[PDB]
């Protein structure tokens, strides 16, 4: 694949010998061997450079063409303001590596300048750029954090960073980069049940989509958080799925077959003094949250509801019973369960 230093030197010597017999000393310390060794070192360094470039190209060349940037790890950097008590009475000099720090336990991060700076006599305040010593987001200190110089002259009135730092980043892994590329490529797909479902889900107010396929017809079930499908949202879905549906195929949009379950419960309780309106409303809010959290294909298992109600409190709640709920309410994929009228009776 590549030559190396010893091989390059050997070939150079062999070619030199073949070219002429006027040189035969190739021992260490020879001018000629030194020159060939230097050329060999330079060539080996260019080989490593080519290796680095190709290793970068293998994993970033193609995907970069599609406007996808891999996030490199960076040091947080930004501008800071240094104010002087008076206009400077001589040219002040700040050497590279001059450290800036903060007087807090929340931000022990240390910042330093990477270049020399000069403040003219006429100046009264000069801005400089400082770089966080550590890579990562730990250097993204908020506004007003950097407020101290460790090697500044007494003439300074105050140090302050005028804006929060945000350039600190963590390296994006190769697998995440591939996943984003592959996601984008999949999103280019069209005229399929998966692609229709994806394009419906990209709509803002759509929470859940079921696509049912028939020969020569497609019907799309959608719902919002509430289990409802507004006419406006329906029209939006249709307009967005004009670009997605296959040619010569009919597409229809319909609401999800919502099913509002009314639950009257009788809750036995131990502490009779804690019986009141607030506990009733808390229990009812828990039941409503449980019922409304169910997704499109989720069946209402009564034993899990009982578990949840009893887990509100392991000793206070004594026993529960329902008259409406006699057996588990199985629903199809296109039929969501939602919270209906809820009543709770404390016993």
């Amino acid at each position: 694949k590549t030559r190396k230093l010893t091989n390059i030197l050997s070939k150079l010597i062999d070619k030199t010998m073949a070219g002429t017999s006027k040189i035969t000393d190739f021992t260490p310390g020879s001018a000629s061997r030194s020159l060939l060794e230097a050329v060999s070192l330079e060539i080996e360094q260019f080989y490593i450079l080519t290796k680095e470039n190709i290793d970068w190209g293998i994993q970033e060349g193609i995907i970069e063409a599609f406007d996808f940037q891999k996030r490199q790890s960076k040091r947080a950097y930004g501008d800071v303001t240094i104010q002087f008590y008076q206009p400077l009475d001589m040219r002040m000099y700040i050497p590279a590596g001059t450290t800036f720090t903060s007087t807090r336990q929340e931000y022990p991060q240390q910042f330093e300048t990477l270049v020399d700076y000069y403040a003219e006599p006429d100046s009264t305040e000069i801005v400089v750029e400082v770089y966080c010593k550590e890579t990562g987001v730990a250097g993204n200190v908020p506004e007003g954090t950097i407020n101290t110089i460790a090697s500044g002259s007494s003439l300074i009135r105050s140090v302050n960073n005028e804006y929060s730092f945000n350039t600190g980043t963590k390296e994006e892994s190769q697998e995440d980069f591939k996943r984003r590329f592959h996601s984008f490529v999949e999103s280019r797909g069209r005229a399929t049940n998966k692609s229709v479902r994806y394009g419906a889900l990209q709509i803002p107010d759509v929470e859940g989509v079921y696509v049912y396929e028939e020969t020569g017809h497609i019907t799309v079930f959608a719902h919002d958080r509430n289990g409802n499908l507004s006419d406006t949202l329906k029209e939006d879905i249709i307009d967005a799925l004009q670009d997605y549906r296959p040619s010569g195929i009919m597409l229809d949009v319909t609401g999800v077959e919502k099913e509002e379950v009314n639950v009257s419960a009788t809750v036995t309780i131990s502490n009779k003094s804690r019986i009141g309106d607030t506990l009733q409303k808390h229990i009812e809010s828990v039941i409503r949250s449980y019922l409304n959290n169910l997704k499109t294909s989720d069946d209402l298992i009564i034993t899990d509801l009982i578990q949840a109600i009893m887990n509100i409190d392991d000793v206070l709640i004594y026993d529960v019973s329902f008259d409406n709920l006699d057996e588990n309410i199985i629903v199809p994929p296109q039929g969501i369960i939602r919270a209906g009228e809820i009543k709770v009776e404390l016993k």
Partner: protein, 234 residues
């Protein structure tokens, strides 16, 4: 764990560093890999380093060389004279000054309540270090009667009982007791008689004490780096 850290020198190269430390240029790629350097490894000045501060190093930047270094097995010739002074100071220990007011407890050597603590003049307790420390400890051991100190039967000297007759025999007994007392100290490599005389009542003698050499103390302290105690429990 400890590693060497190298400051980039003017117009240095990675191959030269590898040859200098690993004794072979072949490790330069390992040095790049460990330090995470881009192709222009050692830029001319900080203006180039501004282009990529993370992946580039300029002149005066510190590199890490992952070679397991150890402070022992280091040539004492490299160590600076101040560093040797500090090392022997650590070896011979620091202790609270009690032998202040030499005249007083020299006037009453055999008695108790003879020495006391003192202040350094800066409102902190006085301290004796290095040779002063050795002086203090040797004086205190010689002055202490043997067996009088609690928790330490053997610490002390029998000179309080050697106030015998004026003949060479008692002189020899004193000399032998003093040599025993000095030998008892671990730091005292050896002790030996120089000269003595008798002036009727008064006995006079002088000794020569060879403490452990600078090399031995340096080796001991640098060995102690492995443990990190840096203290004396002799």
């Amino acid at each position: 764990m400890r590693f060497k850290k190298h400051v980039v020198q003017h117009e240095e190269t990675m191959q030269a560093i590898a040859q200098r430390y690993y004794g072979d240029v072949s490790y330069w790629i390992d040095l790049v890999e460990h330090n995470n350097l881009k192709y222009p490894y050692l830029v001319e000045t900080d203006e180039e380093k501004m282009k990529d501060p993370e992946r580039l190093a300029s002149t005066g930047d510190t590199l890490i060389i992952p070679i397991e270094s150890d402070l022992t097995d280091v040539s004492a010739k490299e160590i600076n004279s101040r560093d040797k002074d500090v090392l022997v100071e650590l070896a011979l220990g620091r202790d609270l000054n009690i032998t202040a007011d030499e005249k007083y407890f020299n006037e009453h050597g055999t008695s108790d309540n003879i020495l006391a603590f003192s202040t350094n003049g800066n409102g902190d307790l006085d301290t004796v270090k290095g040779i002063d420390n050795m002086k203090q400890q040797l004086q205190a051991r010689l002055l202490t009667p043997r067996g009088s100190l609690m928790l330490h039967p053997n610490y002390g000297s029998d000179l309080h009982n050697l106030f015998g007759l004026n003949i060479p025999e008692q002189a020899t007994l004193i000399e032998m007791e003093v040599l025993r007392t000095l030998t008892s100290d671990n730091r005292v490599k050896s002790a030996n008689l120089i000269d003595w005389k008798i002036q009727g009542n008064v006995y006079s003698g002088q000794f020569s004490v060879e403490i452990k050499s600078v090399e031995e103390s340096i080796n001991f302290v640098l060995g102690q780096d492995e443990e990190g105690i840096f203290a004396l429990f002799e």
